[PDB]
Write a protein that binds this ligand. Sequence first.
Ligand SMILES: CCOc1cc2ncc(C#N)c(Nc3ccc(F)c(Cl)c3)c2cc1NC(=O)/C=C/CN(C)C
Length: 285
Amino acid sequence: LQPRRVSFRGEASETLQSPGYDPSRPESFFQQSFQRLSRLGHGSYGEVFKVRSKEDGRLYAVKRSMSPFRGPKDRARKLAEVGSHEKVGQHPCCVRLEQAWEEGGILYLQTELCGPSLQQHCEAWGASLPEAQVWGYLRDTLLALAHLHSQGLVHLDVKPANIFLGPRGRCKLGDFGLLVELGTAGAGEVQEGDPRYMAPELLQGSYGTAADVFSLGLTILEVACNMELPHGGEGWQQLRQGYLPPEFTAGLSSELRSVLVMMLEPDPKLRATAEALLALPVLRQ
Ligand SMILES: CCOc1cc2ncc(C#N)c(Nc3ccc(F)c(Cl)c3)c2cc1NC(=O)/C=C/CN(C)C
């Protein structure tokens, strides 16, 4: 019946307005306050559109949930993505949240528009990315991670689909859907991540910032070696016992291989932190 702002900075959920938006007409705030340009992605969650605002003329991405809130928990769960994104705050290697609102039980998240995901970029090039690119992405994403970890946040979904290219070879970590704030158990908490990137200790319910380091580890491995990660089975196990698969790891320089072994350390207690990684010689200007 009317669009209401979703934020956790202030309590009072307030209604939106926009040039283009006259509440009289039947069309939603979305339909009416934006120029829908194309579909960036879609799935069980809902849809992401590339849009141009009719408020500022700028391009953004807007995620829209698929069906109206099923109940109070379903609402609180979806609304919590906004809380997660807000806890991150502004950082040059984190996707920026513009605003978010709800209307008719549907949640909308409006982010800045970035370049392609790392997943698309690798897919388009169809081969292992050059080592010089990898180091830049490895470094941007560690900076993002160290920003999160310093605040007791764990992304839990580090992977190429959630890393987005920016100008001149930089990138941004985004999509804080599964982000959790450590020390707080719930709720609901720890929705399940992609098993291809799962730190081994998560299997037995051991969660911590170390999980993200391991995920970025496989993420860098995948893009560096044009390698598909296994969902399960012996192959999944082989990546989680310390050593590296020697097949596609061939091209890696000594320095890259060295850093990946640090990140893929099975024991979270012994696994390098993002801070420690960033203080290694190979990873600072
Ligand atoms: C050319 C540029 O393409 C994209 C640019 C993006 N910029 C910012 C954000 C952000 N944030 C994106 N995703 C996104 C995540 C979660 C959110 F909640 C919100 Cl609002 C937005 C983006 C997604 C893009 N495109 C794709 O997702 C590509 C998918 C390929 N296929 C596997 C479907």
